[PDB]
C-alpha cells in the first residue's frame, strides 16, 4: 500500500484538495452507505465534470477539517492507483500477491476506506490465461463481507457499458447519483474555490465576473456540465489575465474578461462589437448594394437580422435569422447570400438541395442510425455547423428537396439545434439561414386567359403556402420577394460584368475600355425581364469575350496592347483594337 | 414494507438482498440519528425514505415545500402561457395525482398529446412545466426519426453492430433522469414504427434497451406535441359562412395515431387559437423579454400603453398564434434599438422612451 | 499563428486541465504549431512563462513496442509520467492523440494510456499538448467524455492567402537549400493563388507548399544536364497545371494552333451544323484564353434536333479532337426519379452506400473532360 495508494487525509490536510462546497445530500448518502453492515461501499455515478471525485476526495477534506459525523471522524481514505499494481508485475502470481497484500493492509487498519476512481478500470490484470478478473475475483468477498469499505467513482456511460456487466460487482456497492448543480450552487462553488484561482493566478475576480461566468457558460458552452464548465471560464480568464502583468497590466478580472473568454471558448464573438466592427457592420448594408442591384429590401433584411444579433437583441435560441428568398431566376437570390458571407468575413456553408430528392437523403444531413453502414460518417449538415458555428448557411433551391427534408429545419429554425446520429447537437444560433427558391415563379410568369390580364403577383399565396407546411412558414423571419430586374439595374449589371471582364483581362497584361454607347447597346440588347441578369453574361460573352479570345489566343491582342471597344451608329456594331 | 416496496421500486436486483439493503440502509440511517441523541427504531416511514432514495423517486410531499410549489403550479404557468388553461390544468392534475399517490402502477406520470393551431404554446407550456417543477427536460425532435431504421438511435444498435456501445438516446436519457418531463416534438413527423416504442412505454412505463436493461418512465411526464390537423384547421371553406374545422382536425389525428395509441394517452388536448386579450398579454410578455435583453447592456426601456395597444392590434392574426408577435416586436422595437445601440446614442446612453402619436401611429424613440 | 499560440499558452498557464488540444483539418499546421512552439521557446520568441520549458514529443509506437508480459506497458507508461512530473517544467506533445485511447490494454481490461493519464491532467500535475483532426476528434475524443474534459480544444483554421504567402516566404529558404533552387516573388505568390483556384481536397498551408516543393524538385532535376535555373511563375504554373489539367501558360505555344484549327478538324467530320461547331469551339477558346466563368463549366450546350444530324457525333469528335476523355452518361438509364442515387450515391446507412456515385467519380477521375449526356429528355 505504501507506494500504491495516496493517503487523502494526508493530502487534504497538508496540501489541500480544494474545498468541497455544499453537496450535503450526496455526502449524507455516502456516509449512510459507508455506515451499512454489509456492502457498505458507495459508488458515485454521474456525468463527467459534476464533482464525483470532488466529493469522494472532498470527504477526506471534511474529515481532516473535522466537519464530519464522529462516526467518520478519524477514518482514513486512501486513493488507489491501479496502474501501479501492474507496473510492479511481470510473471504469474505477482499481481495477486501484491493486490491481496493491500487488502490485508486495509483490513488491518480497520478504519479506512479505499477510493477507487475510474472504477470501471479495475476490470483487468488477468491476461493470456485470465479468468481472474481482479475487479471481482480478488474483492467480491471483501466487499460483501463488510471487511473493507470502498468508495468508487465512474462516468455514467462507463458505468452502464462496462461497470455494469458484472452483476456480482453491480450488487456489491450502493449507487449514488451525482447530478450537476444549478446556477446558484455553481456560483457558491466558485466562490468557495475562487481563493485558489486568485492565489494561483495572482488575480482577483469581481462579483460580476463570477456571476457572469456561470450564466454565460451555461448559455454558450454546451458540452460540459455546470460545476466544471464555469470553472474553465474562471481559470481560463485567470490564466489570461496573468499574462498581462508581463507588460505591467495588473488587473482584477472583470465581467469583460469573462465575456471575452466565454466568447472565445464557444467561438461566438462578443466585445469587438464595441470596436471597428461597428463600422464593418454599419456599412454592410451598403457594400452589398454595390454587388446586388435592386433588391435593397433583401439586403436590408439580412443586414437587420445581423445587427439585432450583434446589438444583443437577438433571440435566445434561434438562428440569427431565417427567411426564404423567392423570385424569378437570375435576380440575385443566391448571389446576395454568397456576397453576404464574403462581406461579413465568415464561412459560407452551401448545400444544394437538389441533391436531397428522396426522403432517405436525410441521412446525409444527420448520419446513419447506429448499427448501420454510414454510421461513423456522421451527418453533413450537422457537421458543417459544428466546425463553423458562425456562418451563413445557404440551402439552394430548397423547393427541390423532398418535402420531408424540410422537417429537419423545424427544430433548427426554432431552437437553433439539430441532433446528429451520435447524439451531439449542432448549434445554429450564430448561423444565418437563407433558403432560396423558385417556387411560385412558374405561375407568376403565366399569362391568363381573358380580356384583362390578371395580376399574378400572389404566387406567395399558393406555391409558397402549398409547398411549405404552416409550421415551417410560421418559423421564418421573412419571405422576401426578389423582383425582376429593371432596365436601370441592367445597366448596373452590365457595368458589373464588364468590370469582371476587365479583371480577367488585366491578369493577362491587357486592358479593356468600353465606350458608354457600347455599354448601353449591350444592355439594351441583352435585356430580358424573364431571365433577370442571367443572359447579360451571355451577351457580354458573345459581344466582348469571343472577339477577345481570338485576339488573345492568336496574337492580335497579347503583350504590348490594349483594346478599345466602341459602338458605331450606322450598324450599331462594336469596334476593337490594340 | 422493505419487501413489498422494494419489489415495486427497485428493479435491477433480486429480492433477498434487494429488500435487506433497504433494511440495512434504514438501519445505518437510524444509526446516524442518535448523534443528536435521538434514539431510533425503524418505522415504515424510514423504510419509505430509504426506498425513495434507492429508487430515485419522490417520498412524501405534504410537509414539504413541494406542497406549496405544487399547489400553485398552475398559477405560475398561467403567467407564462396565456389562455389554454385546460392544458395547464391537465398537466398539473396529473402531477398532483402522482405526488398524492393516486397514480398508476406502471405508467408514466401522465401522457398527453398536444394538438392545435400553430403559434399556440403547445411546446411552450411543456418547456415551462419542466422549469416550473425544477426538473430535467428531455427533448426529442421527432422530425429526426423519419425512417423505419431510426428507431435504433432511440434504443441502440443490436449487439455486435457498429452502434452498440453508444446505446440508445432515449433509454439512456430516461435512465439518467427518471424524474423528468419528456417532450417529443412534432411526433407526427416520426416514422410510425416509432409509435410502437411509445405504445409500450405508455402501458408499462418501460423500454428495454440494446443492453437488455430497462428504462423506467414511471416518474416521467410524457408530452408529445403535434401539428396533425393544422393544415385543415387553417383551411377556409367554400361558402358564405366559414366552418369550424376543429372537428376535421380530429379526424386527421385519429388517422395518424391509431386507437391502440390513443387509448394509452391520458388525454388529447386540442389547443385553441389565441384571442386578442391573449395577444395583449403576449405583447407584454415579449416586451419584458426585450427589456431584459436591454438591461444586459445597461439600457432601460419604457413602452407606453398606447404603444402596446398598437403593437398588439397590428400583429394579431388568429391563424398564426403568437409567433408573429415577435416579428412585430422586431420591426417596431428591436430594429430601431439595434441602430441606436450599435451606432448611436445608446451605446453609453442607457435609456429609451417609446410612445406613439395618434396622427401617424408612429413610435418615438431616443435617449 | 500568433493567436493560436496565445490561446495555447493561456491553456498551458491554467491551474488545472492545462492541456490544449489542437484540432483542425488535415494539413493546416496543427503539428507545425506544436513544434513551432518548441522552436519559439528555443529562439526566445515566447513569453518568459514558456521560456526555458521543454516540450517532448511522444512516440506511441516505441512506448508500446516490446511491452510483452503483464505489467511492462504499465511500468513504462508510469515511468514516463513520473519523469515528466519530476521535470516540473515540461510539456508532453502527442501527435494523433486520439490514438492514446487505443493504447494496448493487455486483454479484456481497461487499463491503458488514457485511463492512466486522466488523473494527472485533472490535477494539473503534467501538461500535455494534443493534436488531432476534426474527424478523429469527433469519432474518438468526443466519445471519451472524461478524457475530453481534460483538454482544451483550440480551433485551428486554414490561413488566408496573404498568410500562406508569408509562411512560404519564411519556409522558402529551406526548399531553396534542399533543391538547390531559388524562387521568384511571382512564383511564390502564384503558388498560393493558383493552388487556391485549382487544387481541391487539401488546405492552403499544405496546398501552396506542395507546389513550391514540387516546382523546386523539378528545377532540382534540371542542373543534372546543367540546366541551372530559378523557379519562376511559369514553373509554378506548370506544376499546378499538372494537377489542374489545363495550363494557363502553354496555351501560348503550339497549343494555340491546335486550338485554332479545332473548328476545321470538326467541320471536315461533321457537315452542316457549323453553328454547333462554333458554339463548342468558341467556348473552349474563351476558357483557354482565360475568359472563363471562374466557377462554372467550360460551357453547357443543349443540342437539339432531327435525328441523324450529328448531335452526339460532334461531341464525340470534340473529345477526340481535343485529346481528352469522353465521359458518357446515357440518360435513358435514369428514367425515374430515384435513379439519381446512381449518379451521386446512396445516403449513409443504405445498401450500396459505399458503391460510389457514377457522375461524381467520373468527374473526379477526369477533371478535364467532355461530359456527354445522351438523350437528356429521356431522363
Ligand atoms: N462541491 C465541489 N467540490 C469540488 N469540485 C466541484 C464541486 N462542485 C463542482 N465541482 C467541479 O467539479 C470538479 C471537481 O472535481 P471532480 O473530481 O468532482 O470532477 P468529475 O465530476 O469527477 O469529472 P470527471 O468524470 O472527468 O473525473 C471541479 O471542476 C470543480 O469546479
Ligand atoms: N441585382 C444583381 N446585380 C448584379 N448581378 C446580378 C444581380 N442579379 C443577378 N446577377 C447576376 O446573376 C448572378 C447572381 O446569381 P443569382 O442570385 O441571380 O442566382 P439565382 O437567383 O439563384 O437564380 P437560379 O434560379 O439560376 O438559381 C451573378 O452573375 C450576377 O452577376
Ligand atoms: N399562451 C401563450 N402565451 C404567451 N406566449 C405564447 C403563448 N403561446 C405561444 N406563445 C409564444 O410562442 C412561443 C413559442 O412557440 P410555441 O412553443 O408555442 O410553438 P408550438 O406550440 O410548438 O406550435 P408549432 O410548432 O406547431 O408552430 C412563446 O415564446 C411564446 O412567445
Ligand atoms: N453532320 C454529319 N456529317 C457527317 N456525318 C454524320 C453527321 N451526323 C451524323 N453523322 C453520322 O451518322 C451517325 C449518327 O450520328 P449522331 O449519333 O451524332 O446523330 P444524333 O444526333 O446523335 O442522332 P440521335 O437522335 O439518334 O441521337 C454517326 O455515325 C455519324 O458518323
Contacts of C214 (CB under 8 A, 6+ apart): C239
Ligand 4 pocket (Cβ < 6 Å) reads: C 270-273, 307-313
Beta carbon of A541 within 6 Å of any ligand 2 atom: no
Decide: B77 and B207 in contact? Cβ < 8 Å.
no
B116 vs B227: CA distance, rounded Å? 6
Residues from chain C contacting residue A507 (CB–CB below 8 Å): 290
Subunit partners of chain C (3 or more CB pairs within 8 A): A
A97 vs C54: CA distance, rounded Å? 39
Beta carbon of A260 within 6 Å of any ligand 2 atom: no
B49 vs B60: CA distance, rounded Å? 8
**Residue listed under C-alpha cell 454521474:** A46
Residue A549 Cα distances to C248, C250, C281, angstroms = 13, 15, 11
B78 vs B82: CA distance, rounded Å? 6
Q: Distance, in angstroms, between A451 CA and closest chain C CA? A: 36
C239 vs C231: CA distance, rounded Å? 11
Helices (H), chain C: 2-12, 30-43, 60-64, 72-85, 113-122, 134-136, 145-148, 161-179, 185-198, 204-220, 233-244, 255-260, 262-267, 274-289, 311-322, 341-344, 358-365
Note the Cα A320 to chain centre separation in Å.
14
Say whether residue B254 is in contact with chain A using an 8 A CB cutoff.
no
B315 vs B80: CA distance, rounded Å? 19
Q: Which run of H or E residues covers position B314?
A: helix B305-315
With an 8 Å Cβ cutoff, are C340 and A363 in contact?
no
Residue A381 Cα distances to A418, A419, A421, A424, angstroms = 9, 10, 11, 12
B145 vs B190: CA distance, rounded Å? 5
Rounded to a whole number, what is the distance in angstroms from the first to the last CA of chain C?
51
Contacts of B199 (CB under 8 A, 6+ apart): B260, B261, B264
User: Within a 13 Å sphere around the CA of A500, how many CA atoms are in the beta-carbon half?
Assistant: 17
Decide: A198 and A204 in contact? Cβ < 8 Å.
yes
- Ligand-binding site membership of A327 (annotated): yes
Closest Cβ opposite residue C354 in set A201, A362, A373: A373
C280 vs A115: CA distance, rounded Å? 79
A78 vs A60: CA distance, rounded Å? 9
A388 vs A448: CA distance, rounded Å? 47
Residue A331 Cα distances to A295, A397, A463, angstroms = 8, 14, 19
- Give the method used: cryo-EM
Cβ density class B45-70: b for 16+ within 10 Å, e for less: ebbbbbbebbbbbeeebeeeebeeeb
With an 8 Å Cβ cutoff, are B330 and A308 in contact?
yes
Going by the DSSP 8-state scheme, the letter that residue A462 receives in this structure is I
Contacts of B288 (CB under 8 A, 6+ apart): none
Residue (of B47, B53, B59) closest to B5 by Cα position:
B47
Going by the DSSP 8-state scheme, the letter that residue A464 receives in this structure is I
Number of H helices, E strands in chain A: 26, 15
Count of CB atoms within 10 A of residue C43's CB? 8
In DSSP terms, which residues pair with A154 in a beta bridge?
Answer: A45
Contacts of B287 (CB under 8 A, 6+ apart): B303, B308, B329, B333
Q: What is the resolution of this structure in A?
A: 3.0
Cβ density class C129-157: b for 16+ within 10 Å, e for less: bbbbbbbbbbbbbbbbbbbbbbbbbbbbe
Contacts of B302 (CB under 8 A, 6+ apart): B352, B353, B354, B355
Q: Which run of H or E residues covers position A380?
A: helix A380-387
In the structure grid, which three cell numbers stand for residue A103, read together?
A: 487488502
Ligand 3 mutation pick, B112, B117, B120, B224, max ligand atoms within 8 A of CB: B120
Going by the DSSP 8-state scheme, the letter that residue B158 receives in this structure is P
User: Within a 13 Å sphere around the CA of C43, how many CA atoms are in the beta-carbon half?
Assistant: 7
Decide: B268 and B113 in contact? Cβ < 8 Å.
yes
Residue B224 Cα distances to A204, A407, B114, angstroms = 48, 16, 6
Residues from chain C contacting residue A48 (CB–CB below 8 Å): 145-146, 149
DSSP codes of every residue in A94-122: HHHHHHHHHHHHHHHH-SEEEEESSGGGS
Residue (of A327, A194, A210, A197) closest to A258 by Cα position:
A210
Per DSSP bridges, beta strands A76-80 and A5-7 are: antiparallel
Q: Three-state SS string across C196-211, please?
A: HHHCCCCCHHHHHHHH
Phi and psi at residue C6, in whole multiples of 5°?
A: -55, -45
Residue B256 Cα distances to A339, A405, B110, B142, B260, angstroms = 44, 19, 20, 14, 11
Cβ density class A146-184: b for 16+ within 10 Å, e for less: eebbbbbbbbbbbbbbbbbebeebebbbbbbbbebbeee
Residues 62-81 of A with CB under 8 A from B: 69-71
B120 vs A74: CA distance, rounded Å? 61
Rounded to a whole number, what is the distance in angstroms from the first to the last CA of chain A?
93
Nearest ligand 3 atom to alpha carbon A410: 25
Phi and psi at residue A6, in whole multiples of 5°?
A: -105, 130
Decide: A325 and A315 in contact? Cβ < 8 Å.
no
Residue (of A80, A189, A193) closest to A139 by Cα position:
A80
C50 vs C12: CA distance, rounded Å? 9
In DSSP terms, which residues pair with A479 in a beta bridge?
Answer: A324
3-class DSSP state for residue A78?
strand
Beta carbon of A496 within 6 Å of any ligand 2 atom: yes
Phi and psi at residue A200, in whole multiples of 5°?
A: -70, -45
Ligand 2 mutation pick, A439, A534, A535, A541, max ligand atoms within 8 A of CB: A534
In the structure grid, which three cell numbers stand for residue A24, read together?
A: 450535503
Beta carbon of A293 within 6 Å of any ligand 2 atom: yes
With an 8 Å Cβ cutoff, are B342 and A282 in contact?
yes
List own/partner pairs for C163-172 with CB under 8 A and 24 or more apart. Answer: C164/C192, C164/C204, C164/C205, C164/C208, C165/C189, C165/C192, C165/C208, C167/C29, C167/C205, C167/C209, C168/C192, C168/C208, C168/C209, C168/C212, C171/C209, C171/C212, C172/C212
Decide: B246 and B206 in contact? Cβ < 8 Å.
no
In DSSP terms, which residues pair with A427 in a beta bridge?
Answer: A417
C74 vs B65: CA distance, rounded Å? 53
Decide: A46 and A158 in contact? Cβ < 8 Å.
no
Residues from chain A contacting residue C337 (CB–CB below 8 Å): 357-358
Sequence length of chain A is: 578
Say whether residue A96 is in contact with chain C using an 8 A CB cutoff.
no
A534 CA from centroid of ligand 2 (Å) = 6
Residue C117 Cα distances to A25, C74, C92, angstroms = 31, 11, 12
- Ligand-binding site membership of A331 (annotated): yes
A529 CA from centroid of ligand 2 (Å) = 13
Nearest ligand 3 atom to alpha carbon B185: 22
Rounded to a whole number, what is the distance in angstroms from the first to the last CA of chain B?
69
Which residues in chain C have their C atom more than 2.5 Å from the N of the next written residue, marking a break after them? none
Decide: A406 and B193 in contact? Cβ < 8 Å.
no
In DSSP terms, which residues pair with B112 in a beta bridge?
Answer: B223, B267
DSSP codes of every residue in C317-366: HHHHHHT-EEEEEEGGG--SGGGGHHHH-PPTTSTTGGG--HHHHHHHH-
Residue A223 Cα distances to A159, A180, A219, A266, A518, angstroms = 19, 13, 11, 10, 60
Phi and psi at residue A138, in whole multiples of 5°?
A: -100, -5
Residues from chain C contacting residue A155 (CB–CB below 8 Å): 145-146
**Residue listed under C-alpha cell 457525333:** C313
Q: Distance, in angstroms, between B214 CA and closest chain A CA? A: 12
C58 vs C150: CA distance, rounded Å? 18
Cβ density class B323-342: b for 16+ within 10 Å, e for less: bbbbebbbbbbbbbbbbbbb
Sequence length of chain B is: 367
A93 vs A133: CA distance, rounded Å? 13
In the structure grid, which three cell numbers stand for residue A57, read together?
A: 476526495
B271 vs B118: CA distance, rounded Å? 9
Give the residue from B40, B53, B153 with the most A CB atoms within 10 Å of its CB, the best one to mutate.
Answer: B153
Cα Rg of chain A, angstroms:
34
Decide: A181 and A227 in contact? Cβ < 8 Å.
yes
Residue (of B15, B13, C290, C51) closest to B2 by Cα position:
B15
A512 vs A367: CA distance, rounded Å? 51
Contacts of A528 (CB under 8 A, 6+ apart): A535
Contacts of C192 (CB under 8 A, 6+ apart): C161, C164, C165, C168, C204, C208
Furthest-apart CA pair in chain C: how many Å? 87
Q: Distance, in angstroms, between C161 CA and closest chain A CA? A: 14
Relative to the alpha carbon of C310, which ligand is closest?
4
Decide: A362 and A515 in contact? Cβ < 8 Å.
no
CA triple A363-A365-A368, angle to 5 deg = 30
In the structure grid, which three cell numbers stand for residue A26, read together?
A: 450526496
A382 vs C257: CA distance, rounded Å? 50
A490 CA from centroid of ligand 2 (Å) = 12
Say whether residue A53 is in contact with chain C using an 8 A CB cutoff.
yes
* Closest residue of chain A to B234, computed from CA coordinates: A470
Amino acid at each position: 500500500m505504501e507506494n500504491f495508494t495516496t493517503n487523502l487525509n494526508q493530502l487534504a490536510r497538508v496540501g489541500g484538495i480544494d474545498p468541497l462546497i455544499g453537496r450535503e445530500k450526496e455526502l449524507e448518502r455516502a456516509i449512510q452507505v459507508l455506515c451499512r453492515r454489509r456492502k457498505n461501499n458507495p459508488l458515485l455515478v454521474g456525468e463527467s465534470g459534476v464533482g464525483k471525485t470532488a466529493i469522494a476526495e472532498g470527504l477526506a477534506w471534511r474529515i481532516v477539517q473535522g466537519d464530519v459525523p464522529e462516526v467518520m471522524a478519524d477514518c482514513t481514505i486512501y486513493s488507489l492507483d491501479i496502474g501501479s499494481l501492474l507496473a510492479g508485475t511481470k510473471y504469474r502470481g505477482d499481481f495477486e500477491k501484491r493486490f491481496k497484500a493491500l487488502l490485508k493492509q486495509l483490513e488491518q487498519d480497520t478504519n479506512s476506506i479505499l477510493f477507487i476512481d475510474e472504477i470501471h478500470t479495475i476490470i483487468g490484470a488477468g491476461a493470456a490465461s485470465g479468468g481472474q478478473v481482479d475487479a471481482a475475483n480478488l474483492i467480491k468477498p471483501l466487499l460483501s463481507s463488510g471487511k473493507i469499505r470502498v468508495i468508487g467513482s465512474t462516468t455514467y456511460q462507463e458505468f452502464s457499458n462496462i461497470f455494469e456487466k458484472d452483476r456480482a460487482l453491480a450488487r456489491r456497492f450502493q449507487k449514488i447519483d451525482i447530478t450537476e448543480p444549478s446556477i446558484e450552487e455553481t456560483v457558491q462553488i466558485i466562490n468557495g474555490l475562487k481563493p485558489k484561482y486568485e492565489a494561483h493566478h495572482d488575480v482577483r475576480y469581481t462579483a460580476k465576473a463570477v456571476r457572469a461566468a456561470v450564466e454565460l457558460a451555461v448559455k454558450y458552452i454546451n458540452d460540459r456540465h455546470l460545476p466544471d464548465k464555469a470553472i474553465d471560464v474562471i481559470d481560463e480568464a485567470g490564466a489570461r489575465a496573468r499574462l498581462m502583468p508581463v507588460s505591467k497590466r495588473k488587473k482584477t478580472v472583470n465581467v469583460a474578461d469573462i465575456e471575452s473568454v466565454v466568447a472565445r471558448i464557444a467561438r461566438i464573438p462578443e466585445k469587438s462589437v464595441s470596436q471597428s466592427d461597428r463600422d464593418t457592420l454599419k456599412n454592410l448594408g451598403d457594400r452589398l448594394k454595390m454587388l446586388v442591384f435592386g433588391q435593397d429590401k433583401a439586403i436590408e433584411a439580412l443586414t437587420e437580422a445581423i445587427k439585432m444579433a450583434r446589438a444583443g437583441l437577438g433571440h435566445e435560441h434561434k438562428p440569427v435569422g431565417s427567411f426564404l428568398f423567392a423570385g424569378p431566376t437570375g435576380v440575385g437570390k443566391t448571389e446576395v447570400t454568397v456576397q453576404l458571407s464574403k462581406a461579413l468575413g465568415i464561412e459560407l456553408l452551401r448545400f444544394d438541395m437538389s441533391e436531397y430528392m428522396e426522403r432517405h437523403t436525410v441521412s446525409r444531413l444527420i448520419g446513419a442510425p447506429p448499427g448501420y453502414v454510414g454510421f461513423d460518417q456522421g451527418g453533413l449538415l450537422t457537421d458543417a455547423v459544428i466546425k463553423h458555428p458562425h456562418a451563413v448557411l445557404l440551402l439552394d433551391e430548397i423547393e427541390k428537396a423532398h418535402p420531408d427534408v424540410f422537417n429537419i429545419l423545424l427544430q433548427v429554425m426554432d431552437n437553433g439545434t439539430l441532433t446528429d446520429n451520435n447524439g451531439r447537437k449542432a448549434d445554429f444560433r450564430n448561423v444565418v439561414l437563407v433558403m432560396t427558391t423558385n417556387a411560385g415563379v412558374r405561375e407568376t410568369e403565366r399569362k391568363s386567359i381573358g380580356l384583362i390580364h390578371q395580376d399574378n403577383s400572389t404566387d406567395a399565396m399558393e406555391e409558397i403556402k402549398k409547398i411549405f407546411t404552416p409550421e415551417f412558414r410560421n418559423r421564418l423571419d421573412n419571405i422576401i420577394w426578389f423582383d425582376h430586374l429593371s432596365t436601370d439595374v441592367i445597366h448596373q449589371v452590365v457595368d458589373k460584368f464588364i468590370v469582371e471582364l476587365q479583371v480577367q483581362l488585366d491578369q493577362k497584361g491587357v486592358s479593356l475600355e468600353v465606350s458608354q454607347e457600347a455599354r448601353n447597346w449591350l444592355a439594351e440588347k441583352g435585356y430580358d425581364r424573364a431571365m433577370g441578369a442571367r443572359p447579360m453574361a451571355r451577351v457580354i460573352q458573345d459581344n466582348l469575350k469571343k472577339p477577345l479570345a481570338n485576339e488573345l489566343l492568336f496574337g492580335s491582342l497579347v503583350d504590348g496592347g490594349q483594346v478599345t471597344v466602341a459602338l458605331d451608329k450606322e450598324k450599331n456594331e462594336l469596334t476593337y483594337g490594340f
